[PDB]
Amino acid sequence: AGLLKKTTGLVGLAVCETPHERLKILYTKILDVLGQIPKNAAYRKYTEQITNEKLGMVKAEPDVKKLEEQLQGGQIEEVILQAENELSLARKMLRWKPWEPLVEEPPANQWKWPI
Amino acid sequence: SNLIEVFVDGQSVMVEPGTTVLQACEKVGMQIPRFCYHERLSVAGNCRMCLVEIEKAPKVVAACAMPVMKGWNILTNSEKSKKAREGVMEFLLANHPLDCPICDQGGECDLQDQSMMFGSDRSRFLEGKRAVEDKNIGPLVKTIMTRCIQCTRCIRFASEIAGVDDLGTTGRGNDMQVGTYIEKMFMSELSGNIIDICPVGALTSKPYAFTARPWETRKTESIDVMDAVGSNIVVSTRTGEVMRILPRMHEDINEEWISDKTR
Amino acid sequence: TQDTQLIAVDEKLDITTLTGVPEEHIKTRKVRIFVPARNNMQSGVNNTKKWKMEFDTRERWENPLMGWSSTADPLSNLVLTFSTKEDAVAFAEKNGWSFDVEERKVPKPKSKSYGANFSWNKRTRVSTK
Amino acid sequence: RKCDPHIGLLHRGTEKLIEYKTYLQALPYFDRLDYVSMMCNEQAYSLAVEKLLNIQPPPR
Amino acid sequence: GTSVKPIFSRDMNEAKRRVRELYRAWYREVPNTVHLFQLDISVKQGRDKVREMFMKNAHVTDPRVVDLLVIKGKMELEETINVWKQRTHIMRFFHETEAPRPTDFLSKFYVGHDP
Amino acid sequence: TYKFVNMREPSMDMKSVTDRAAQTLLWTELVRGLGMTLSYLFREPATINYPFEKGPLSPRFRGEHALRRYPSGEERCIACKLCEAVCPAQAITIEAEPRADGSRRTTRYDIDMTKCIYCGFCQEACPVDAIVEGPNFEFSTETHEELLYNKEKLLNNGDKWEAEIAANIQADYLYR
Amino acid sequence: GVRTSPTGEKVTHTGQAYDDGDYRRVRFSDRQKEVNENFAIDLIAEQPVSEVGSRVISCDGGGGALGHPRVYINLDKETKTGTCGYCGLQFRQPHH
Amino acid sequence: YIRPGGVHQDLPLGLLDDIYEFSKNFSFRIDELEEMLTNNRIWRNRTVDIGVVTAEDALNYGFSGVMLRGSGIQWDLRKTQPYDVYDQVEFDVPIGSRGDCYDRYLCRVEEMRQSLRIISQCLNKMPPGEIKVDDAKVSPPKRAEMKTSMESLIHHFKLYTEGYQVPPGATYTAIEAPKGEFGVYLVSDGSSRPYRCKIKAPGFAHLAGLDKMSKGHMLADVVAIIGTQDIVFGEVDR
Amino acid sequence: DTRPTIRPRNDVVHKQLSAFGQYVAEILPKYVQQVQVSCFNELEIFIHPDGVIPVLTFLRDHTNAQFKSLADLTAVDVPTRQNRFEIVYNLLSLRFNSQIRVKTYTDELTPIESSVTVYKAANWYEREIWDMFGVFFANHPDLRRILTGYGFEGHPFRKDFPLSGYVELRYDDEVKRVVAEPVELAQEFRKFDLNSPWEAFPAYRQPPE
Amino acid sequence: ASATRVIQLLRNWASGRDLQAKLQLRYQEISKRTQPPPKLPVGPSHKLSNNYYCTRDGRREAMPPSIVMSSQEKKAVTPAPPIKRWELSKDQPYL
């Protein structure tokens, strides 16, 4: 927390003045969109393993200055940006649906370099 | 049927009884280093570079002349097998004259290729080197006996392949001079093939001497027309002309031998 | 299992037109296939294991000044490497080169022995060792 | 509005001939690739090649 | 094996459909390219030449291949009309500098030992 | 570790802004440039007087090739054919032939100066130090033909620069 | 030394000789046919024959590091005097 | 000079001394640049706030080296992935804070000074020892050993005609070139020759990104952006 | 290192990368056909041609991967494979300082939908893979030629394309314009067959086939 | 160097610094070009005692890529620990 940081050190990236709850209502959203995905999905178990877990201290600890080393994710103003891509990514494999078997096995021994 | 079972550094393979260790290795693709054995020229067993250790062995077996039987895991990449190859090769290379720049075998020499794959990277020799006096057995093949390593591949080739008894290894000790002792000549109709069986530049073609080097010689496949046998041969062409002719691998027609006229 | 607006083409796949080898280098190049025979004075065999894509040699004349080997065959110094053979041929027709093969001269099993060199009736007694 | 950096006015074979030159013979290409940073190129090549060879240069 | 991907066209019918309007573009441009590139050839020989390279590959049956030359041929008409190519780049198609190559068997035999 | 390069804190006191206004109004920083270049003029130049004096070089210098010969005078070259095998531009062409004595050297050692790239690999390749490449760099010309050096041209040049390169490899072979 | 062709055309050590017409000769016109006067074959043949009384003698060629790869040529042939391959200068044993 | 397995030759005796004399005087020469340009208004106005790019687009554009560092991106190959000795040396990476052309110019001149730090640290800490690996199969033997030891002759022979055979596989090795991140990706067939070598050109992505910077600037600034892109074309043209 | 000649290994990164290999493996068993971590701590993700967007978008936005840096993408024309081309992306993660390699196979005709949306650095990185190799990239902004000459014919990096090509230029004074002719060299390439007939390192030897 | 103290003063004042301390040219400080012959060291494995190449097999010791998963409770991991935010340069934090 403390005095609002004038600049985050990355041009284009802006300092958000309400970062803790922005992480909160983002982090709920991936948990929300994860609801559609099946339980057997490998994505979901990994998602919930780091979503509400990392929703933990941000819910508990409110000082973003201490929150830097809570997630080892760098500056908070890009962590919420990173959470945005995770929310974005969750939408992506809501369509890819990758837990089916391979579309096609690799044709003959194409791999196995050298030739 | 009667094909005895045996392992080769792990994986097991069946094999005809009486087969030697060398002939069991290539069944899976192992070309164990050899210098005195030719698959169609007797069995010498003197180069000792075929030495590979068997499982639970107290001593390294000579893979050329050892018949393999049930349950003998060929320890190809074993430390002792590589140790045996390393020691035995340096002994071969010890008295070898420093002729690689001036020797035509350079670029296609088995001694050079072996030292790249199965060999050291420095010398521990601090003495003089043996100097064998040169010989002369014809104008078709040069004789440089200082480069010889006494693989005896020639004397077997003369004895059975060429059917003429005019090659031998006179002397004793370090003084194994392979040649003719007395002054003689070697123009058997297959005497030209004596060049290819030689693993070193000890025997080289006088007409081809100092004319080309192996890497530049583009190779082409053609046939022999000197004779009605129609031998399969490979023609060397570089910079737009032919230098030397080599026999090809054709067990039915020529095996790997060609007539002196063809060569 | 890979339905993406799936279509079917039964024609043998040729890509010569898009590759764009000039029309005099597409039919007048008898492309022959073989496994390189081992150099007969090189006991090693780590060359008799693949397939190549060598062409037919063309005219090689000497340069007037410096005795070069000036050559107008752009494709002379090119060989491909193929593990097995039908891919090598499958390569061959897809650009539609004049095509032929040669079967791999596999070494026949040599029945080797060492006691034969010391026989009692048979002539395989070696005369030197 | 838009700028098209049409390049290729220097495109040499480079990688194309490296398939035909040995590792030692291919080394001088990098000196000529990013020609103003002489050693830094061949630094990459040597680091790359020795990595495959599983051989590390002496500390000197 | 027979079942395969439609890069741009399912059927040979729409393959020509891509050839048609592209030929129309490759028909229309001739008066303007011959004008601003400042050549000496006439429009008509440009027109019938356009036919010529439309001809040599008018023998393939695979829909992917033919429409691959469609995009391949799509890739020079703009390279010309936006004056990207040079006068030396479109006279190159008008192969002129070489002497006529030999057609009869006698002419090849006289010239050299090369089919 | 790291450090910032443009975090600037312009102090907004009445003192400091006076300098900033003084900087903008009176071209102080521009005058800094003028006095900077003036000091350069008042210094000596470093233009070497070519050809009356040339650049400083080193014994390892790579220049124009020249085949040498033994103290006896016979050509060091034995046609081992290593140099063209490593020659990265294939500028070295050579064909060995039988000689009358039997010391069968080459009838052809043609190095194309317009193809060669002066890596010096040929020197390292040669086991008898036959082909070295000398300190000369003035071997310019007006026709492309005279850069296609042949066996005779290298031999003549080796006999020319023999006085120089002999000492160069004398003072550098320990490094090699 | 160096000989001269019928067209003058000083023949190099290799033996090159442009024949009578040989249109390629026109390049030497208005110019000079660069030939090295020193011929290796006869410039080493007159060198003194070494006389060392041993069966095997090294042939480093002077300045071992600076010379040529040291060989161990044999000295037992009395018909002719054995010479190093690289050096070319001849070793002979005095009455063996 | 830089060959696989080390370096080809040794430094001549006293060479470190001359470069030490050069190192002392070059800090002044840097001051000439900064005094000449850094505070000059004409220099700044043609450069400041020109061709700015945000951190996300800069990284997404595949940029590398100073291109990222100028935009405040916290990254450097010599520090994050220290190859060679670069771990046993200290230097401050000059991270900018605006992303425009001026920030990179300050970053580059600071890179000069930090480079001068490396010269001093390497100078006082140059260890003894050999120049190449002690493996003749990949390092040509010493000229002295060439002409006395037979193994050296064979190893030198096959190395200069056939060359060492690199084990099959592939590798994209990456180092921070002064231009940026110059990486070479090669696939080894297992022979003595490479099969295919792909080089990462820092200029390639930079010249690819030349479209984005130029938007919102004049042609007299387009020349400025081309300068700061460090687009040496033989490097970009591969 | 007790053996300074050999390069030391690092198993710490090796099995950590191996752990991350299985991580991505379980998420997409429909795409990831093959995962491989080499001796020199290099991770390889062998993917299906359809997966150029998903796995790269996955590798770019995931919290445990964060691979947003497109190092390079290159093709490896292998004639003996039925899919001659092998497009090989490279990813760099700033957060975990690691490198990820993904491979997709292709014929001459099978297309790859452009990865411009995932990595916008890839815009210029197809204009030459289309040039040098000829693999067409679907739904891509511009597929223009930037390495080959204007109107040049062929894909030179294809291993069936000769070193010297087919066309050589010369300024013809008859037409006052440089023009192309079939190539004819002053000297032909003295190709060298330097592959030793004796087997190399037996570690990667091919199984009896 | 040659240059008199008068215009040396002009350079020093105009440049704002003393230039006689270090100049862009060279002088007698350069090591002379006839350096004594060196005695370059030997290799670490140059010993003629146990030195078998079976020990150092850099080319040979390489192994194929290790098979871990092929087409033919759990925890979440990362390819490496997340980077550490380095601190400012203690020598000079802010330019």
Ligand code: SF4
């Ligand atoms: S035979 Fe082989 S080892 Fe002997 S000199 Fe000739 S090339 Fe060298």
Ligand code: SF4
């Ligand atoms: S001369 Fe050659 S073939 Fe005869 S024994 Fe010696 S190495 Fe063997």
Ligand code: SF4
């Ligand atoms: S320096 Fe020597 S080896 Fe290198 S290109 Fe020139 S002639 Fe060839």
Ligand code: SF4
């Ligand atoms: S100059 Fe040296 S390297 Fe070249 S062929 Fe002659 S001896 Fe061999």
Ligand code: FES
């Ligand atoms: S093969 Fe057994 S000793 Fe030569």
Ligand SMILES: [K+]
């Ligand atoms: K031989």
Ligand SMILES: [Zn+2]
């Ligand atoms: Zn000698």
